[PDB]
Each structure stands twice: as C-alpha cells, then as structure tokens.
C-alpha cells in the first residue's frame, strides 16, 4: 500500500488510467502456459532473439459469440481487436470464467514483419502488398512463424493469417460489414432528442466494444441465420462528448411467433440504456415495456448481454428502487453515471455545469 499526501484546503480531482506492467518473454520452445499463468497478466510483450516459441493455451475456452466460426473469427476483426505498430502485432483474446465477467489477455509479437517494408510510416508499400497477402501471406512472414501460426485453445485451433488477410480485406474496404456512425448534427427529431434508424434489424445478438481512445463500437448482427451480416454502430469521442451527443437509435427485431418489437437505445457513458416495448404486441394500448442496462466494470473493454440468459423481469418503479438499494452497495451504473457527471463538470476546464 503505498500513500499519497495531498492539501487539505481545496477539492481534490484525480483523472488517472491504470495499465497492467507488461509480461516480457524472451525464451524459445514449446512454451505450455497453464490457465493462471495466462490469466495473470494483461499484456505480454515477446521479442525473439534467435527463434520463435510454440505458445500452448490449456483450457483456454476461447470466445465467442458466433456458432460459425468464419463469422465471429472477424467479429473480434469487426468489434475491432489486432493492432500493428511497426514490426510488433498485438492480438487481443478472450476466454470464459467461472466467476462473473468474460477475461481478457493480449499478445504482442515482434519480427513477424520483415525489413523490406520498416517505413510503416508510408501506407503505399502495404497497400501494394496487400493483394499479395491473399495469395502468399507466408512470404511476408519471417520464417520462425511459419512454424507458429497456429495458437493451441485446448479443444479448438486459432488461425492468424486469416485474421491478418481479412484484417487487410476490411482495411481496404473501408478506403462486407456495414457501419453507422453517429455526430452531433447527425439524427432525425424520456430519451428527447436525436433519432437514428437502423437500415436492417438486429437480434437479442448485442455487444459493446469500448475503445480506450473514447469510441463506441456497438455491434449488430443480421437477425438471419443462413448468411450472418452483422452492423456496427460508432460513436467517435463520445467519452468526452457524451453531452454534445443527443441521439438515440431505433430498431426493430422479429420475434420467432412474427412478431416485431421495438427496441430503442441510448448510452449514459457506457451504460447501455435499452428499452423493448412490444408495440401492441400482446396488449391493448398498453404494452409492456422492459428496461435493461449494462456498464464496463473495472474499466473493462467487452461487455453485452446475450438477452437469452441474462435477464430480469423489471418495471420503471421496481428498476429505480432496486436501483437505489444497490446504490447503497454503490450500483455500478449509478457510481458510472455520477463519476461521469464529475468528469462532464470540467469540459470548460473549470468547475461549472453547463
């Protein structure tokens, strides 16, 4: 425990983020690393001297959120997670624990990209390259991963020149899944204020990325199984922005009886506000209507709701006061909602409510 002394004579404000020391690793073989010895750390950092090793994951339940594994590989390509900065790639992953919440662990690597192209700086090379990456991703690839390109996930594999090729596929794309993105002068005229309607529905299929870099990636699937083509909704700045930004968007999901309910969503920082109201779905001029939210916990960076098996039966009146009575064990969307506030309060830079 270590403590910190501060003046007693004014308010006292603290902005601060917390990053895990990075794991260095430098040996080389078939490294086995058992499920706590992956579960520690949150980054690991490899820089090879002479050659690469052979990462084994025991018991490492990866996840996701798609049957088929050629639509959800590029969810994680499409919530967004693989970065490269310079010659190192940092990979994130997520596996399931028994305890509440989903883990997370990111790899970085080295000396996968050769020299030919260390001028990153300049994007034609890789836009050259990029068509030469779906027919020969290999020839790129330095030769002590050509051995490695596989990551062992206990009962399953994992495929990196597949994420890398579609990585570069959605790149190009961008310059399929399709993206809506929301502003402050973006939005048709309790939630007052901007609306935005989805082009094409979604399902109970719902999730939220957030970025450290303050932009929202809502994900939205297809609501059709036979082809999966999933929408994502972005937020750009919104964590300090979030005041500036008044629109809420509007969707409209099948039910198995053909039925369409309404579902209509706002975010209070990362809390997921979602209202589904049955539009005369079973009652008469009185529908029912379900509230539901979540908040990233612990500063995390994945969180949703299958909408399946988590769930609660909640009116207005019975979802404040439970609300309230797990504000006295600090609720987390409530300590969210008043921490944010307290952040809004200096966008001019001085204490004031605008």
Not at 131 to 139: E, K, N, V
Not at 209 to 216: F, S, V
Not at 271 to 289: A, H, L
Not at 300 to 313: C, F, K, P
């Amino acid at each position: 425990r270590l403590y910190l002394i501060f003046e007693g004579k004014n308010n006292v404000l603290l902005r601060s983020k917390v990053h895990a020391a990075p794991l260095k690793i430098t040996s080389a073989g078939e490294m086995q690393l058992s499920e706590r010895q992956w579960q520690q750390q949150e980054h690991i950092i490899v820089k090879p001297d002479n050659e690469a090793p052979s990462l084994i994951l025991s018991e490492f339940r990866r996840f996701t959120i798609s049957s088929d594994k050629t639509f959800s590989l590029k969810l994680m390509c499409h919530q967004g997670m693989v970065r490269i900065d310079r010659r190192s790639l940092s990979v994130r992953l997520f596996y399931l624990r028994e305890q509440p919440g989903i883990g997370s662990l990111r790899l970085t690597f080295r000396d996968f990209f050769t020299e030919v192209m260390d001028t990153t700086d300049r994007e034609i090379l890789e836009k050259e390259l990029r068509p030469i990456l779906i027919g020969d991703t290999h020839r790129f690839i330095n030769a002590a991963y050509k051995n490695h390109l596989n990551i062992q996930l206990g009962d399953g594999v994992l495929n990196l020149a597949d994420i890398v090729a579609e990585y570069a596929r959605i790149q190009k794309e961008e310059t399929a899944i399709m993206t809506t993105t929301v502003t402050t002068d973006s939005g048709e005229l309790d939630l007052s204020g901007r609306y935005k309607s989805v082009p094409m529905a979604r399902k109970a299929d719902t999730l939220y990325h957030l970025t450290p870099k303050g932009d929202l990636q809502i994900i939205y699937q297809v609501a059709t199984k036979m082809v999966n083509q999933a929408m994502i909704v972005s937020l750009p700045n919104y964590r300090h922005e979030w005041e500036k930004y008044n629109l809420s968007i509007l969707s409209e999901i099948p039910q198995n009886n053909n039925t369409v309910v309404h579902s209509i969503l706002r975010v209070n920082g990362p809390t997921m506000q979602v209202r589904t109201i049955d539009y005369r779905g079973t009652d008469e001029n009185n529908p029912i209507v379900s509230f539901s939210d979540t908040t990233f916990i612990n500063g995390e960076q994945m969180l949703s709701y299958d909408s399946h098996s988590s769930g609660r039966v909640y009116s207005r009146e019975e979802y404040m006061m439970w609300e309230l009575q797990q504000r006295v064990s600090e609720a987390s969307s409530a300590r969210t909602q008043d921490y944010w506030l307290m952040d809004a309060a200096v966008r001019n830079g001085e204490w004031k409510i605008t």
